From a paper:
IN first catalyses 3′-processing of the vDNA ends, exposing reactive 3′ OH nucleophile groups that it uses to attack a pair of phosphodiester bonds within target DNA (tDNA), resulting in strand transfer. In this work, we determine the three-dimensional structure of the deltaretroviral intasome and characterize its interactions with its host factor, the PP2A-B56γ subunit. The deltaretroviral IN host cofactor B56γ14, as part of the heterotrimeric protein phosphatase 2A (PP2A) holoenzyme, interacts with a number of chromatin-associated proteins and potently stimulates concerted integration activity of deltaretroviral INs14.
To aid the interpretation of the cryo-EM map, we generated a high-quality homology model of the STLV-1 IN/NTD using the SWISS-MODEL server, and determined a series of X-ray crystal structures spanning the catalytic core domain (CCD) and the C-terminal domain (CTD) of HTLV-2 and -1 IN.
Numbering used by the authors:
A (entry chain B): 54 to 145, 155 to 197, 200 to 209
B (entry chain A): 54 to 146, 157 to 197, 200 to 211
The structure:
């Protein structure tokens, strides 16, 4: 749907169990390039949501238009304020399968080395999927930048 | 020093006071493009070192060569095993970058006292990599030129 990089992203929160806790992985995916940002948070309040959104912006750049579900955090005024501050249109699966690839990569890296910190695994997965996996022949990173 | 993006990085840890504590900002900067990665950690051990380096790789790409000081973390065996495992050359053969970031932090936290440190760090990165024009290019543009 996005016509170029950073036109439209889709975002969701998905869950992942690590050493007994069920973490919130805040996920952003660019609908043109497929490039992805994931941030491991403990919860899904507006603070964590904005926090993970800012991290995605450092990774991918600032999007024109983001699409989400009707989650409370996305509908909160804190988040609406952020969006307006940043000049981002906000409206209410590419995500489901992107999620799938990330989780299979965390499961693999954790099987190989059980004591791997969750952050390392997430950053290894992000680098693999964005920058290594070829799709035309291009990586998501190439098409993004 | 680096001849194209991701040829040679420099990294260092530097200190930043926020509220009570003295935080470790693990900084990696690409010597060709300028592009920067910064990870806020509570300490400067090999765990924290490796973690911050993986975040940088996810932000920046994998470098061929890294230059660091002689700090404990960098000389440890966990760090050396990470490097060889990733085909990164490491030597012990930045301070201006550290200064530009800390100045953006200070400015951000002066305008809004409650702004979380992590958000300030990510706002800085985005500004410094993708907004500041230098050449007439940003660091990001140079970093991603094929
Ligand atoms: Mg949801
Ligand atoms: Mg030092």
């Amino acid at each position: 749907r996005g016509l170029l990089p950073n036109h439209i992203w889709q975002g969701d929160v998905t869950h992942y169990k690590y050493k007994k806790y069920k973490y919130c992985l805040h996920v952003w995916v660019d609908t043109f390039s497929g490039a992805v940002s994931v941030s491991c948070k403990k919860k899904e309040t507006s603070c964590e949501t904005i926090s993970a959104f800012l991290q995605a912006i450092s990774l991918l750049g600032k999007p024109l238009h983001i699409n989400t579900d009707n989650g409370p955090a996305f509908l909160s005024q804190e988040f609406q304020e952020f969006c307006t501050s940043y000049h981002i249109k906000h409206s209410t699966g590419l995500v489901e399968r992107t999620n799938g690839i990330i989780k299979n990569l965390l499961n693999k890296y954790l099987l190989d080395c059980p004591n791997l910190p969750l952050d390392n695994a997430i950053n290894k997965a992000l680098w693999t999927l964005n920058q290594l996996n070829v799709m035309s022949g291009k990586t998501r990173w190439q098409i993004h930048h």
